[PDB]
Copies of this chain bind each other. A is one copy, B any other.
Amino acid sequence: DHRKIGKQLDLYHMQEEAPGMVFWHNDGWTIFRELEVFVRSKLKEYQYQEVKGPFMMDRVLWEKTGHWDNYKDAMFTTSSENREYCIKPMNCPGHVQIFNQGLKSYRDLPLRMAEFGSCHRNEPSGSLHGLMRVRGFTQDDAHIFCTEEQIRDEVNGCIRLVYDMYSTFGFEKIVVKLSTRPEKRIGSDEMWDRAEADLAVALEENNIPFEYQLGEGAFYGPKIEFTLYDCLDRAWQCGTVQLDFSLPSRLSASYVGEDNERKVPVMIHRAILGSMERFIGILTEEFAGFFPTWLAPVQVVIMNITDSQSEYVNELTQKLSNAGIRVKADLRNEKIGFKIREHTLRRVPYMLVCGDKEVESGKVAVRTRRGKDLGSMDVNEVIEKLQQEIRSRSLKQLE
């Protein structure tokens, strides 16, 4: 269970003073930040912008989207100077405002606009569960503005990017669902027939078996849902592709087409990891806290046996820190066996131990959180191989 592992590894905490809100401690914020770096490596490759929308906008804008009439109960509101404001439950409206700045043509499409966008949703407190269902979360979110003609390739690109990103983490059970029109929605039936059909088609062309969830899509679009399973095999919506012919209309999005007329862009919404919070929860149970090195909060701990090797440990720690390895020295006045056990429990991938023979040889005794003892290794060989394991984001280790 991530909530117990999350306690043990000092990843995050939660309190009653903020229900469904995460306090990311150093170590879990490091995992979060590493998933950001990972996501942006993939954004760049698939050519996305990255923006940041504000945290609140006038409730008039949310009335415009139908979010007011279709989603009122889920939204936090505040106010200033007789004006009411919604804290954003979603990033899409604010990407649309960004898109509406500057005249756009068919030559700007597809325009792929991402954001690590902090959403707040007034989820019933009875529904809240760990990191999986929270009131405040950051989606690895994006809206793609495109033509009707570009839908197929754009939705296929989102699907590809889900299986690409997920293979880094080695998930066995990825169950896909198509969530179709809810009772309370925007857009005509015809728009919903086209959007439901385009996503089912996308799934069949990508060879993805899927199950309907009838009535379960958003008010503004049907969803492809990439469903991951926690250690009690509960199903959690993670990766998410939706198709929307209504929102950009409602927010006066337009572009100048080839024929030189005003057209309304189609909008694809996706989140690949879903939310960082839920994805981290899933990974934590997926790995049972044994995060791959690239994700591990602390990758290496260097311990002296006695005071005598402490300066060697500090030099080595600096040297690894400079190679870009998340390393800590543990120079505490404790028995080595007590320090090894501490960091093993914290699931530090590599423990380097320095006695006088390590000092004399300029080597280091290496062991893992799995209890593997790799013996004495050249220091530059330890750095070189760690950087290989980190750069390639390897699923498992030096053995």
Contact = CB atoms under 8 A, between A and B. Distances in A.
A248 interface: no
A50 B297 CA distance: 11
Nearest to A101: B13
B60 A23 contact: no
A174 B78 CA distance: 37
A308 interface: no
Contacts of A60: 17
B55 A120 contact: yes
B50 A30 contact: yes
A392 to B, nearest CB: 16
Contact of A17 (B58, B79, B101, B113): B58
A397 interface: no
B101 A55 contact: no
A54 interface: yes
A26 B55 contact: no
A117 B122 CA distance: 22
Contact of A98 (B25, B30, B78): B25
Interface residues of A, number: 52
A233 interface: no
B22 A54 contact: yes
A94 interface: yes
Interface string A43-69: 010000111111111101100000000
* Copies of this chain in its oligomeric complex: 2
A135 B80 contact: yes
A32 B51 CA distance: 10
Contact of A21 (B54, B98, B135): B54
A60 B60 CA distance: 30
Nearest to A55: B136
A210 interface: no
A125 interface: yes
A120 B120 CA distance: 15
B10 A102 contact: yes
21 contacts: A10-B101, A13-B98, A15-B57, A18-B54, A18-B56, A18-B57, A21-B55, A23-B53, A23-B97, A25-B101, A26-B50, A29-B50, A32-B52, A33-B50, A55-B55, A55-B87, A55-B136, A76-B80, A78-B87, A81-B125, A118-B118
Interface of A: 10, 13, 15-19, 21-26, 29-30, 32-33, 44, 49-58, 60-61, 76-81, 83, 85, 87, 94, 97-98, 101-102, 113, 118, 120, 122, 125, 135-136, 321
